Design a protein around this ligand. Structure first.
Ligand SMILES: Cc1ncc(C[n+]2csc(CCOP(=O)(O)OP(=O)(O)O)c2C)c(N)n1
Ligand SMILES: Cc1ncc(C[n+]2csc(CCOP(=O)(O)OP(=O)(O)O)c2C)c(N)n1
Ligand SMILES: Cc1ncc(C[n+]2csc(CCOP(=O)(O)OP(=O)(O)O)c2C)c(N)n1
Ligand SMILES: [Ca+2]
Ligand SMILES: [Ca+2]
Ligand SMILES: [Ca+2]
Ligand SMILES: [Cl-]
Ligand code: NA
Ligand code: NA
Ligand code: NA
Lengths: 556, 555, 556
């Protein structure tokens, strides 16, 4: 069997070469044309498989496995609309730099024709998002077509780790008959390639005249899956305040120089002249702080550990493509700069601000109170996955010194795929998901992975019956007559039926009090639905956004 | 063994199928990777080859071969930047709807990699301009890789004829070794395909209220390689004036209803009220007429025999995708109205305007005087290829009732590849090329085909040492300190040396008096360089542009 | 009016910010729609313009200015097929990593429509080649239209200098009226931005198990515009032979470990067993050495100082993105071993090989002898620009220890734009061009830059009236009847007329004896045409390709 041999050799060598570069699990979607490679993944004894019927949720689930395992994961689907369902997670992968390996199976080269049944053009179909894309040769007996696997995987490997990391696309034409020879297990190897690892440094001589000024600020944004330890060391030696995003992983250390309440301080009118700012990582969540960067005259230095850097919210004076740890290690040099006065001011504001939050949280009965209680209930060394919209903004204002991790899909900021991404992380981590009802409806299909494979994850569902974030927009007042139809968008759905469909336990609370004396338990994966009111949430959030306004004028 | 026989079969079949759908000649550029299909065309007894070392001029030479033969023509190049040089003529073919078949050879799929030596991405590299692009499978002995030719040639044929006409692209990977079995001549077939022929008609009931209004106008723009006879029939029966562009192929008939001086008329301040206009073809050359279309309140009907209709310069009231003949034929079987005084008003403007042009052409000493003489010197039933920039504007104003044809690359309006396109038509037609010096410089490499292949074609070279069209720009006054350097851009080239290099005879005229008593009949192809001055040309053109202002006010 | 001020503020700020990021030259092509930006470049007192009517040659001319100045250069053209003529130089810039800045002028959105007169789609029209593309907004009075220039310029700057270097695209729509206010000279500023610099390092310990083996080779390909000195330092300490390409810039040092005759050695039948190879830079010219790399089972390391690494001709076992100097200074932490015998075998072969080459050049009378004599004549510390096809193969075989630099277009290996690229380099460096007749005809229009602006550059034209390189192909014997028509392609042109047209001096040599006893350097730029015969060249080259056979007796 000349064809069966070549197809088996190609498909089994490809799966092993994916293993050789770090792939340990794949998410497969059912289909006919994907048969040869699907069987290779299942037969390979060191590649775990996950079968997912929904291609959209499957790709977001794989994004979750990548964020949880810190390894590249591959997805495999058949030809046609299946591949088109990958685009949302591929788009989030592009911005968030997720090493997602997209494999689309195709008809053989001689049979392809755009416009035929189930025949879209798949070659370079993700060109808008990926940095690597290749159309595999058809399998034959020659040595050159096998070496293409080694040749192309070596090129592709530069996009799976380091700063060039991002989604890649292999298009794989397969000729009938499709089923390979399952006896050739000798071609299912488990070798391990040596991966290149670098270390960077910069000469900061021309920068010491800035860094030696007194009123300096370190601003750390999204830093999931990066190391941040040397940021704390530089801050301790040089007395520099750190404004730390929730996704910076820096608030859990309880560092005496970490400022967590900056979004409330700036919202309430904090206005200080600062000499320089060191923006590290992806942008922060705080709308008000990002707007302050577009107004300050401070010297701006941006530090980001990826290629294709974007300088949101404003072009800095210099942009460094380097890891935060390597950057701050180049900056350590004995100097006699006293800025204790500058640091003691920020340490003092943060003290009073942390106190005012605790006073608001004692009298709060709104959605923000529910979020504060979940923060209190989360065990140390555990993790929260926070959905987009308001949950991630409440975490910013409310997470202070708890030793926990928070994760999010803060790349494209979509409300899609949150369930699937959280579940993928729960495969490897102890995580609890916090989500609004619109995102929960968006990726309801994602719960199938919990039902079929018993992935342990509780879900804290905030149900204010629509889009709450829009209450804080000007259209609530300038388009009152159309607000609830265009922006409210209530579903009115009974999510207790969702729990029974996907075999979650269900509990509903109508006040923070019942939530306070309850206990989240890992006996089974359960959905806790907390009922809030969007109008009530807006009123109470307004109270919170101006709580610090008195201390600012008082400290002045 | 099998490889040579599989490669021969695929490549000889592909060449034979191209013949079956209309291809009779190809323009090959040298290279190694293009070996198998290059030898196929040369071996095929009914496919003529042209070998051109400059891929840019080669693609424009193919465009000319298409325009002169009215049959699709293929170009073949090797992998790499050879394919990238095709892009200018591919972009011109997208707008002008030229059925140019673009064949790029590639390395085999298993060896492909963007960034390797001589390795750009050729798959869908012309996606920005073509309506059909295919990456062929590597040659096999199986029937399905051979049937892919029959399958994709049938799909690609819809872009070679009719309204979907335009450029198409095949990327052909070839595996080493690349030489085919030249003795397998049985696979070099010469079948001829039967092809669909349609006729269209529209329901004109909801257009009769417009068409029965008196003050109507038929505006015919670019109609190259299209049939226009029923336009004259409808105009005769219904007393409608025809504002005929030079490229409409209508001015040569000396029809009593064809107005040739509309551009000067509208330049001189014509401001008649019009009930409706029927715009047929691609946009006209006249900037002033296209501005008037953005101002008139007339009912606008657009008629174009091609898909992807663009509606320059303004969206009409209705757009019909139909040939001109099939459009006017569907309106002919109707009753008639009396609009004779409207037709005669226009006929009187044309008679006096033509009399004023004859007067101007006796005094003038500028570039437009040279152009008018060439029209007079052109033998009847012969053709002219007009460059872009000023020459196409001067033909618009000066070509009246002469029985000649005029062609031009009026899609992208590029100054590139003019020489090669003109020579391409010259293989099939009696053609004289009129061209400015900068465009002559641009495609000087295109002259190689005249030397190597003995293409009889004379060249009238209008040399004013720079870009004369920019004299009529507001920058000539508003940016005078920088004008000559930025817009003038003289070369100072002695084009007699170009004539010697490419084995052209040469003659240089400094005045229109010498050119008038000269003769363009030549034993060998020859280059006539006519020396003019850009400022002198600007000043005399402004008199020409305003000449009809007094006669217009006397109507 | 208001439009004239907003337009002026846009183009004057755009041109200044280009200067701020390093642009000093711009090559403008005439057109109407380009008027605003064209006058801005002319009016700017510290940007020099070149005016070129042929966009194809113009873009290759800019490539040469980038190579000569080692700065980014911008090109500007009007709408339509003018931009399409840029494609070949952009393709070469993609592979060779040339920071070519492509500026295409476009109609405003109200007149943007594919199919309209002179209206091709220009936005992302270079998606196939460039690393950055942007469609500028139409100028208006808002500050954000200006701020987009500062924002986008910082992003685009990362593609102009480092390992991410490559062609970038700006499409700029301009609305009538087009003339800017030339009295607003205050907006044409000459600030200079600070640009980041890094130093990388790898952990040599991961390669330890390989680099302690004795039969190791360093193979250095195209390294032009790169630092190369630490390769010599590393090879000296560790006794490693260096096979050096002409474009490696390493042959001009007479380093005891540099091998320049490897190609002839392989052609002459050299067989060798290698423990490891370290491939540095872009691929080597030698077909034999690249074919050998596909057959050896040595451990292979690839090191390139650019992103988007391709691994031609075979997949290495590991590949590093790092400069050669940073890589080898990292390998300098290892202790040495004993491979002195291995080095001696290579040093002895190179000694006899150089004597055999010198012997050949005394006897040869073909195209080869002309090239060998041109190298001898060239002044030291001057430079050659070598065309593709045979001249670059002959320089590989004949260039030994002459103290000169060699440059070429070795990305896409096209025969287009060679003349213009050398001329661009001659503006910043002392260079003589060596080019075959078919490539000379291909870029004949590029000589306009020499007539108009009086660039000093001699041209050595190897005229054999056809494609000489195809003599060495299997087609010469397999399809001999069609060879002259399809591969020879004689033009029969008398290039004395080309010299008169572009105001060059002309001298024609029919014998190597005439050429050896002549003087080339002169006050005026000269075209030296050396008539040779393709058939005799093939035969004499056969003797050269076997001139080193009597030195090879045993496998290395
Ligand atoms: C895929 C996608 N569609 C739409 C949006 C726009 N969007 C942002 S927030 C939001 C509503 C989120 O509602 P919910 O999850 O209930 O949270 P809440 O606003 O109540 O906190 C929408 C539709 C988006 N970000 N992503
Ligand atoms: C490829 C290309 N580049 C630029 C232009 C812009 N352009 C239009 S007309 C013109 C000048 C051409 O001058 P020439 O052919 O000498 O004729 P003249 O204006 O003197 O009549 C130019 C550069 C173009 N049309 N095509
Ligand atoms: C743009 C382009 N077209 C075609 C080729 C294919 N090609 C490579 S070398 C060559 C011949 C070059 O001839 P010439 O400059 O006279 O050099 P010779 O072979 O005689 O040394 C050709 C056509 C190419 N590399 N690039
Ligand atoms: Ca909600
Ligand atoms: Ca001119
Ligand atoms: Ca030659
Ligand atoms: Cl030497
Ligand atoms: Na498995
Ligand atoms: Na033939
Ligand atoms: Na200037």
């Amino acid at each position: 069997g000349n064809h069966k041999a070549a197809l088996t050799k190609q498909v089994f060598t490809f799966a092993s070469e994916l293993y050789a570069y770090g792939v340990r699990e794949v998410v497969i979607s059912p289909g006919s044309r994907s048969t040869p490679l699907a069987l290779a993944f299942e037969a390979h004894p060191n590649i775990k498989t996950w079968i997912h019927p929904d291609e959209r949720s499957a790709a977001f689930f794989a994004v979750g496995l990548i964020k949880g395992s810190e390894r590249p994961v591959a997805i495999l689907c058949t030809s046609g609309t299946a591949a088109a369902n990958y685009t949302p997670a591929i788009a989030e992968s592009q911005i968030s730099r997720i090493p997602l390996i997209v494999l689309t199976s195709d008809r053989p080269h001689e049979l392809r024709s755009v416009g035929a049944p189930q025949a879209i053009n798949q070659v370079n179909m993700f060109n808008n998002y990926v940095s690597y894309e290749f159309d595999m040769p058809i399998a034959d007996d020659s040595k050159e077509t096998i070496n293409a696997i080694y040749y192309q995987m070596q090129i592709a490997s530069q996009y799976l780790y380091g700063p060039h990391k991002g989604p890649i696309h292999f298009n794989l034409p397969f000729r009938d008959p499709l089923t390979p020879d399952l006896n050739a297990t000798e071609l299912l190897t488990s070798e391990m390639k040596i991966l290149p690892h670098y270390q960077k440094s910069i000469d900061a001589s021309a920068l010491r005249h800035i860094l030696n000024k007194k009123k300096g600020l370190i601003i750390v944004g999204d830093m999931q899956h990066q190391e941040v330890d040397q940021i704390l060391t530089y801050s301790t030696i040089y007395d520099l305040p750190i404004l730390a995003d929730p996704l910076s992983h820096l608030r859990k250390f309880d560092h005496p120089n970490v400022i967590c309440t900056y979004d409330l301080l700036f919202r309430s009118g904090l206005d200080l002249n600062v000499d320089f700012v060191i923006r590290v990582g992806k942008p922060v969540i705080s709308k008000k702080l990002n707007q302050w960067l577009k107004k300050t005259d401070a010297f701006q230095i941006l530090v980001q550990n990826n290629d294709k850097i974007d300088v949101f919210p404003i072009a800095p004076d210099i942009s460094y493509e380097i890891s935060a740890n390597d950057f701050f290690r180049s900056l350590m040099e004995d100097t006699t700069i006293n800025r204790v006065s500058w640091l003691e001011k920020w340490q003092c504001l943060e003290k009073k601000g942390r106190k005012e939050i605790k006073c608001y949280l004692e009298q709060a009965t709104d959605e923000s109170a529910f979020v504060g209680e979940l923060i209190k209930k989360t065990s140390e060394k555990d993790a929260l996955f926070i959905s987009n919209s308001m949950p991630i903004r409440d975490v910013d204002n409310l997470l202070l010194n708890k030793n926990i991790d928070v994760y999010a899909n803060r790349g494209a900021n979509g409300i899609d795929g949150i369930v699937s991404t959280a579940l993928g992380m729960a495969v490897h981590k102890r995580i609890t998901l916090l989500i609004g009802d619109l995102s929960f409806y968006h990726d309801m299909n994602g719960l199938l992975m919990s039902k079929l494979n018993n992935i342990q994850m509780n879900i804290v569902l905030l149900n204010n019956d629509g889009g709450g974030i829009f209450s804080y927009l000007p259209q609530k007042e300038s388009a009152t007559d159309y607000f609830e139809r265009l922006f409210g968008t209530p579903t009115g759905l009974d999510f207790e039926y969702t729990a029974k469909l996907y075999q979650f336990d269900f509990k509903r609370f109508n006040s923070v009090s019942e939530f306070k004396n309850a206990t989240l338990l890992s006996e089974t994966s359960t959905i806790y639905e907390l009922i809030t009111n969007r109008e009530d949430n807006f009123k109470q959030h307004q109270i919170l956004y101006q709580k610090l306004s008195e201390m600012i004028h008082d400290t002045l």
